[PDB]
Every structure is written in structure tokens, then in C-alpha cells.
Amino acid sequence: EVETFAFQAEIAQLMSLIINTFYSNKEIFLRELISNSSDALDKIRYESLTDPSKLDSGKELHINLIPNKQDRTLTIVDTGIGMTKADLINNLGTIAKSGTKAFMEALQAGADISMIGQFGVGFYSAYLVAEKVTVITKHNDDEQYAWESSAGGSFTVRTDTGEPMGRGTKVILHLKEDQTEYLEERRIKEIVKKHSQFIGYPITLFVEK
Ligand SMILES: O=C(NCc1ccc(F)cc1)c1ccc[nH]1
Prior knowledge:
Elements: E1 2-6, H1 9-20, H2 28-50, E2 63-68, E3 73-78, H3 85-89, H4 96-108, E4 130-138, E5 145-149, E6 154-159, E7 168-175, H5 185-195, E8 203-205
Parallel strand pairs: 2-8
Antiparallel strand pairs: 1-6, 2-3, 3-7, 4-5, 4-7, 5-6
């Protein structure tokens, strides 16, 4: 049972701008997603300070980067707080309507795409490199869900029968044909060291057979 939803108009507009603007500095997508992961880990860590049982679903607080050249996917896994179904539908837990409004004024007032994270919509920079994005998520207060979108104005939500996650979020980037450099180990390492060197959680770059 798959539910299909239209993006709000302002979010569709943001995604088409990200997809269609000529803009070479695509590597910032990884910085934005890792920072989202760090924010989600901060949240569950804060909750556990007063309620240890919040970590019954998983004590480890980390970020894994998993390239797969056969599937042409880069997956960013974190064990942060996760998202409820309502969170997924409501722009993946963001205030994306007012954030997009601000971002797009900033772009006409000098800024560039790399500044997207300052407006709370950094997730959508995934479409700089991905033709389709799948988000699997598990929050302590809900079941496990899969969100998916290839842009084009709609996204789907379904219950995820896949491998159970415990708690956290998995962003699966189905990369564009000409963006496979972001599956290469030395390129990922360079980007992490350049842009995420002060993230307060271990980031493990998985290797391939
Ligand atoms: O660059 C501009 N729009 C294109 C754009 C592309 C991606 C993005 F995430 C945000 C905007 C702009 C608008 C106003 C001044 N500059």
C-alpha cells in the first residue's frame, strides 16, 4: 500500500531550481546530509539525557557512508532520532515552505546554492547528484517508513518491509549517470575532510569488495 503525495508548490520549485541551475560545486550535498545526520543525533542524545530508555533502540550514535558501485548508490546512515510518518510527509521534518522563501530571496540577493543549509532545506541538495532519493526512517514513536521521490512534483510514502533499522535515518542516493565520482573512496574522503571535519560523531566510510 503506497501513498502518493504532491509536493507543496514552493518545494517543487526549489527542487526544480536545484535540478536545472548550472552550478558546478555539487559536492556540498554530502556536507548538508551529514550535518542533518549530526542534528538528528544531537536530538536523540538530548532526549536520552533525562530518559535513558530512549536508547533502548540503539546505544551507538554514528554516521556511516556506504557506496555501492553496482547499484550506483551512495547511502548515508545515521542512528539519530529518526522521523515519524507525519514528519516525512511534512517535508522530512523541515519548515521547508518558509525556508525556501528565504533561500530564494537570498539567491537573488547574492547568495549561491552552497548556502542552502542556512535555510533549513539542505536535504534537497541531494538532487544536485541524485536522480532519485529514498529515505528509510524509524522513530521511537512510530513504525519504519520509506519515503521516495524522483522530483517531478510528487513523493511516495509506504511502510517499509525492508531490513529493520532500530532507530535513525537512511538516505539512499540513486546517483545520476555522470556523478559516479561520489562513489569513489578518495573523493568521498576528500569531501568529508574538507567540509565535515568537525562533526562530533564517528563517520565511517565503508569500502567495497
Ligand atoms: O540562484 C538563484 N536561483 C537558482 C537556485 C538554484 C538552487 C537553489 F538551491 C536555489 C536557487 C537565485 C534566486 C535569486 C537570486 N539567485
